[PDB]
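Batch manifest line 244
LIGAND: chloride ion
JOB: complex structure
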Amino acid sequence: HLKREHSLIKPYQGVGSSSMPLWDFQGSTILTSQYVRLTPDERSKEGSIWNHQPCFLKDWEMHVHFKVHGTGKKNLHGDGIALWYTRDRLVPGPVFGSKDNFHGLAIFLDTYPNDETTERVFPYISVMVNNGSLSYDHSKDGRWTELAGCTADFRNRDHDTFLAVRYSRGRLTVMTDLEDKNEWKNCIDITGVRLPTGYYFGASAGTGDLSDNHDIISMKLFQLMVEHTIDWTKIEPSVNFLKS
Ligand SMILES: OC[C@H]1O[C@H](O)[C@@H](O)[C@@H](O)[C@@H]1O
Ligand SMILES: [Ca+2]
Ligand SMILES: [Cl-]
Ligand SMILES: [Cl-]
Ligand SMILES: [Cl-]
Ligand SMILES: [Cl-]
Ligand SMILES: [Cl-]
Ligand SMILES: [Cl-]
Ligand SMILES: [Cl-]
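JOB STATUS: finished
ARTIFACT:
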């Protein structure tokens, strides 16, 4: 149930050949045969990669093989990666290399605590749903708009690191595989998440005074076979909340 057209898999399609590429590469992104480097380990970069077509699956699960790694000493690295399922695509900006006031879903892999009064241990993975009205407060690591999150040790690991994002029937689940255990450990599991079909998958990274290599190695999108019993492209991104 792999959907190849919404995936990035080695050998990358159209790279070193006449075949149709499936992704657009934007900003500081460096394309090599063995990784897509959203930013090099250099300051003040914004790079992204965006699926060349929109996704109309109602129920899906994206697996991302990524690598964040750099030569910054002690805590002097940043800023992280965002994964996107959004109305718009290709616009750079302050939100891990991509535009603010976005429409849809963001999954942030934040590696630098901008918030001087933070309670979190970094890196910190969180999710945000936006109808266009919200601005991600980068200076505060998105504190005001975070729906859920978990600390996650993903930098400079000696083995492969993966993230899974599952969306089906209003349930959004983010899982990690960072500890070389060939298993999905839960990070976030929330319900009442409303997203339309017809949005774009993408990934972006950003660096400022602090930097890191932010690599995407592969992205594999799976269609979930889930029963349904409305115009799904017109659903406004939103979240419904269980009452107290
Ligand atoms: O890179 C770390 C840091 O560098 C600068 O201070 C700014 O660009 C911040 O937004 C960024 O988070
Ligand atoms: Ca941050
Ligand atoms: Cl590809
Ligand atoms: Cl490089
Ligand atoms: Cl800041
Ligand atoms: Cl915020
Ligand atoms: Cl770290
Ligand atoms: Cl390690
Ligand atoms: Cl893990």
